[PDB]
Amino acid sequence: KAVATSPSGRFLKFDIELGRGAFKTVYKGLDTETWVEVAWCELQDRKLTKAEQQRFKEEAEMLKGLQHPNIVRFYDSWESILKGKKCIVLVTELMTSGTLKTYLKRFKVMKPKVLRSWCRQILKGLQFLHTRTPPIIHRDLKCDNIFITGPTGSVKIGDLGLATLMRTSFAKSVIGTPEFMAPEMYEEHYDESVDVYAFGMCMLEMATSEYPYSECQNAAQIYRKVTSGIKPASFNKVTDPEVKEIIEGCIRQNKSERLSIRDLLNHAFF
């Protein structure tokens, strides 16, 4: 049976590892109110500074009050202080139907009706985030972080609890994916147009089934291309001219000339 219980007593932890990476370990959890499996994520405190743990504690207090049909649910989070553990626990919605990357690695061409429906649902999720008070930036948008839901084949972007943990020094240097970062995202301050940039790289990955900036071998080569206006090589492999036009407007180096979520949703293609 269960080996741990959330402080609220709602979620139970089972000693069943569902996944493990360089950053977190995911265990099988159980929601005692709805009787569905959840993701019991654990992050060791040695990978987070004291300031990052404190900042996440305050951000998570408001993120667990956010829900959207196109966003993976972030349920709860707390600090597990015990001998041999000393970690931060995150309880999120358990996605088992794979990601967009999972099915882009197995199929060559995506139907234009499917690319239109999925990109629109992603834009709807970002629109809901950017229009909150205060605005919320996802900061971790990529096809490897967009999950399929069983019914109707809807898509959900990764939960905000794990997405905000990608800002930490450990995540940016160990599990970072700089090929989805806007040129101004490398700086100390940026805004919500960063999500528009990452969305353009997501559509580029759907339209080509190829990883953006795959010709580069290190993050330094990716930084020099992006900060010099050099588009990735797979950008020219887009067959649809209208799709290629939307992608360019999302990955423009100058964020003032870059498209907005409003312009994308009002575009004739979406």
Looking at 159, 191, 195, 240, which residue is catalytic?
159
d(CA 183, CA 225): 9
User: Could you tell me if residue 230 is left (phi over 0), alpha (psi between -120 and 50 degrees) or otherwise beta?
Assistant: beta
User: Could you tell me if residue 213 is left (phi over 0), alpha (psi between -120 and 50 degrees) or otherwise beta?
Assistant: left
Distant-in-sequence, close-in-space partners of 114: CB < 8 Å, separation ≥ 6: none
Instruction: State the alpha helices, DSSP H only, in 64-111.
Output: 100-104
User: 3-state DSSP: the chain helix, strand, coil percent, rounded to 5?
Assistant: 40, 20, 40
Buried b (16+ CB within 10 A) or exposed e, 8-24: eebbbbbeeebeeeebb
Whether 162 and 139 have beta carbons less than 8 Å apart is answered as: no
How many angstroms separate the most distant Cα atoms in the chain? 59
- List beta partners, residue 88: 43, 79
Instruction: Please name the helix (run of DSSP H) or strand (run of DSSP E) that holds residue 241, with its range, or none.
Output: helix 241-250
d(CA 20, CA 56): 21
Extract the tokens encoding 132.
């909150």
Query: Which residue, 117, 124, 206, 202, is CA-closest to 154?
Result: 117
Helices (H), strands (E): how many in the chain?
Answer: 9, 8
Extract the tokens encoding 146.
């967009």
Query: What are the DSSP E strand ranges found in the chain?
Result: 4-5, 11-20, 25-31, 37-44, 74-80, 87-93, 146-148, 155-157
The SS3 of residue 77 is: strand
Whether 23 and 171 have beta carbons less than 8 Å apart is answered as: yes
Is 92 annotated to bind a ligand? Reply is yes
Is 142 annotated to bind a ligand? Reply is yes
d(CA 173, CA 23): 11
User: 153: burial class by Cβ within 10 Å (0-12, 13-18, 19+)?
Assistant: exposed
d(CA 193, CA 212): 19
State the resolution, in angstroms: 2.2
Query: Which residue, 75, 61, 105, is CA-closest to 6?
Result: 75
The DSSP output letter for 39 is: E
Query: Which residue, 152, 57, 35, is CA-closest to 97?
Result: 152
Distant-in-sequence, close-in-space partners of 110: CB < 8 Å, separation ≥ 6: 104, 206, 207, 209
DSSP one-letter string for 164-233: HGGGSHHHHHHS--GGGS-GGGGSS---THHHHHHHHHHHHHHHHSS-TTTT--SHHHHHHHHTTT---G
Whether 161 and 90 have beta carbons less than 8 Å apart is answered as: yes
Domains of the chain: 1-93 (3.30.200.20), 94-270 (1.10.510.10)
Distant-in-sequence, close-in-space partners of 126: CB < 8 Å, separation ≥ 6: 138, 141, 157, 192, 195, 196, 199, 261
Let me know if 159 is a catalytic residue: yes
The SS3 of residue 100 is: helix
Give me the sign of the Cα torsion angle 145, 154, 203, 195.
Answer: negative
- List beta partners, residue 19: 26
Whether 256 and 212 have beta carbons less than 8 Å apart is answered as: no
Residue with tokens 């499917």: 114
- List beta partners, residue 258: none
Is 33 annotated to bind a ligand? Reply is no
**Which technique was the structure solved with, according to the deposited record?**
X-ray
